[PDB]
Design a protein around this ligand. Structure first.
Ligand code: HEM
Ligand code: SYN
Length: 455
């Protein structure tokens, strides 16, 4: 029979809404889940969702015959500049399935072999930056990781160089994309959005949408004009046809895909590299085992695709960082039809669910009692992990299309970092996780002492 769902504290007619009026709402929801357990109701004026934390319930939420992707309010705000690109589209929009089918070959593990050389171009620029630091300078870790991931998406995707390692202030496009994301997220905690206080925000948002559209629309038009034949993401969208409908993407949807790759991939991936290096410096025995593998495998001056696939322990480090702090920490679902969740929670068609990934990844019934320890070896026998226990890239057809790109990039870069430098947590850095659409260890800094191995 039916179980009644717990609910966190309420604020009269505002219901639970003021609980998300905080700088770190994911971390606040994790503490609620510790207090209330695997499922709790969350109400706001005019809306409700149910937050899920256990593998037992999230295995069912991941059944695509019963639940489909919902656009969170954050994604609906991002949609104002990401349009109907893949991340901010409903599964029922025609341009979702058309873009999914056209793009999927461009994102496969096999496709990584053609992106590898340009990933090494940007990775070598990061290593050279660090080798050229003076004694006792330091590294700002998320900032350098983000320079790397943005430049790698831009080059590998569309043959465009942001030249982030040549700058203090980013390329105008980046400045506009970052200020537009930041406005979209700030709209989630704005009590009176038509107050004159926000006139300048409005004006600045429209200006940044035009900067992004103008740049990306020109890159697409320049490529079509030159007839330059390439195999990059832009090439495949200009050339590719959906096998189902037989149609290509139009130029406006190509622009939205390019903007989408930039915003979906830049901070997720740079957060994964930042959290990985954080956990290595805080666990020197794990750092040592990952550095030994990098030295044994990366025997040439430039890593090859085949070498990066042999950095097995580096891969487990990266999975263990995604376990503890998955950098896109939540995703939303709706019930396609009335159904019962977990034998005891009846749901009506349209009812929303939220998957709280960091909490899923702390389920002691899956991982055992040491869930807060950073132990990459927990990924040595991955066939033993039950279904839907480990969800940093989302679920099903609406899972991350960039997963192979992100992990090849992060394994290559973290392997080169461990081959080339010893690392010092010179400030005994205290973890402070800043939340935007993604998670970052804010202010994480290290010193890197060169092992003096040439490139
Ligand atoms: C470690 C890094 C990354 C993480 C943790 C991550 C995480 C996720 C998650 C959780 C989703 C599902 C969102 C939802 O259900 O609402 C998603 C979707 C998506 N991501 Fe990633 N992502 C990463 C890197 C990337 C990269 C590098 C790209 C592009 C190059 C990319 C492109 C996309 C796209 C286009 C979608 C929407 C796919 C669809 O719905 O068809 N991501 N990602
Ligand atoms: C479009 C932004 C985004 C960010 C994280 C995951 C998926 C998409």
């Amino acid at each position: 029979t039916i179980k009644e769902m717990p609910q966190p504290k309420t604020f009269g007619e505002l219901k639970n809404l003021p609980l998300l009026n905080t700088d770190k709402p994911v971390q606040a929801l994790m503490k609620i889940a510790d207090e209330l357990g695997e499922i709790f109701k969350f109400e706001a004026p005019g809306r409700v969702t149910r937050y899920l934390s256990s593998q037992r319930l999230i295995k069912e939420a991941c059944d695509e015959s019963r639940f489909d992707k919902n656009l969170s309010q954050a994604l609906k705000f991002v949609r104002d500049f990401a349009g109907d690109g893949l991340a901010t589209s409903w599964t029922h929009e025609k341009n979702w399935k058309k873009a999914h089918n056209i793009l999927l070959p461009s994102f496969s593990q096999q496709a990584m072999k053609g992106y590898h050389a340009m990933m090494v171009d940007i990775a070598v620029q990061l290593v050279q930056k660090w080798e050229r630091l003076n004694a006792d300078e330091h590294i700002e870790v998320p900032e350098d990781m983000t320079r790397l991931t943005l430049d790698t998406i831009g080059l590998c995707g569309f043959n465009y160089r942001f030249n982030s390692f040549y700058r203090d202030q980013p390329h105008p496009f980046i400045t506009s994309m970052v200020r537009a994301l930041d406005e979209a997220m700030n709209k989630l905690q704005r009590a009176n959005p038509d107050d004159p206080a926000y006139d300048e925000n409005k004006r600045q948002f429209q200006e940044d949408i035009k900067v992004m559209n103008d740049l990306v629309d020109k890159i697409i038009a320049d490529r079509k004009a030159s007839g330059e034949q390439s195999d990059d993401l832009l090439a495949h969208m200009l050339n590719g046809k959906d096998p189902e409908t037989g149609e290509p993407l139009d130029d406006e949807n190509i622009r939205y895909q390019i903007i989408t790759f930039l915003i979906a991939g830049h901070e997720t991936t740079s957060g994964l590299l930042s959290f990985a290096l954080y956990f290595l410096v805080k666990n020197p025995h794990v750092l040592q085992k990952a550095a030994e593998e990098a030295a044994r495998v990366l025997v040439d001056p430039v890593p090859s695709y085949k070498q990066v696939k042999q950095l097995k322990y580096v891969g487990m480090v990266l999975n263990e960082a995604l376990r503890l702090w998955p950098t896109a920490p939540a995703f939303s679902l709706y019930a396609k039809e009335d159904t019962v969740l977990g034998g005891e929670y009846p749901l009506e068609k349209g009812d929303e669910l939220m998957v709280l990934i960091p909490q899923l990844h702390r389920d002691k019934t899956i991982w055992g009692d040491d869930v807060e320890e950073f132990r990459p070896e927990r990924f040595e026998n991955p066939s033993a992990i039950p279904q839907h226990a480990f969800k940093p890239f989302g679920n099903g057809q609406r899972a991350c299309i960039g997963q192979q790109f992100a992990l090849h990039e992060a394994t290559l870069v973290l392997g080169m970092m461990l081959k080339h430098f010893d690392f010092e947590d010179h400030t005994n850095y205290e973890l402070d996780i800043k939340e935007t659409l993604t998670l970052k260890p804010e202010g994480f800094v290290v010193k890197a002492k060169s092992k003096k191995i040439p490139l």
